[PDB]
């Protein structure tokens, strides 16, 4: 999902890459660096937002998103969810789920 013109939860909600990139995406797999036996939940991930970003936009807001019709007022509940879910980085995870 890190390349220009792409979509997905990361490409639409996390870090939008304009179709006109000049530059390089270089990644590695921190299986022996970032995973712990009990699960490393220090890396947080949003799945819900009101709208998609603009390129190189950063939102660090923690406002609770309103999935229903009623307002959440900064409190979870029915149709109210926090933005960030954490990741189960574990050294026994499969290649797709590894860091």
């Amino acid at each position: 999902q890190i390349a220009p013109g792409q979509t997905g939860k990361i490409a639409d909600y996390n870090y939008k890459l304009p179709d006109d990139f000049t530059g390089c995406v270089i990644a590695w797999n921190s299986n022996n660096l970032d995973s712990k036996v009990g699960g490393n939940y220090n890396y947080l991930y949003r799945l819900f937002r009101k709208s998609n970003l603009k390129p190189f936009e950063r939102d660090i807001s923690t406002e609770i998103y309103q999935a229903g019709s009623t307002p959440c007022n900064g409190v979870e509940g029915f149709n109210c969810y926090f933005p960030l879910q954490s990741y189960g980085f574990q050294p026994t995870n499969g290649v797709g789920y590894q860091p």
Binding site: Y41, N42, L44, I60, T62, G74, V75, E76, G77, F82, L84, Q85, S86
Partner: protein, 115 residues
Amino acid sequence: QVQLQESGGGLVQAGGSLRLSCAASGSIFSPNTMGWFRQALGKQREMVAVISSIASTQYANFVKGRFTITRDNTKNTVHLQMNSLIPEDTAVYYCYAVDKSQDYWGQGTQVTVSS
């Protein structure tokens, strides 16, 4: 290296009180936001509460009117007053510094309440 010192948990009978503490060292630029999160074995991080530099306090409905957050501007530290405890509060808690840059978490504070 931003470091958060968290202390003050343990085992307390139902109805007791505790006072956790998180002290922030390192960069911690002035517009910071310090919050506390809950995790019981088998669940995710449950945001207990949040305070910003504006002095505003935001709490979830899980513990309405029971948990409080106190600030120390001189040392820029935070204390969680943990009162009217119920076995549903049995969860390890963590600290979250929003700050303006890289976020940093704590090491954990065990809070157990049962009879």
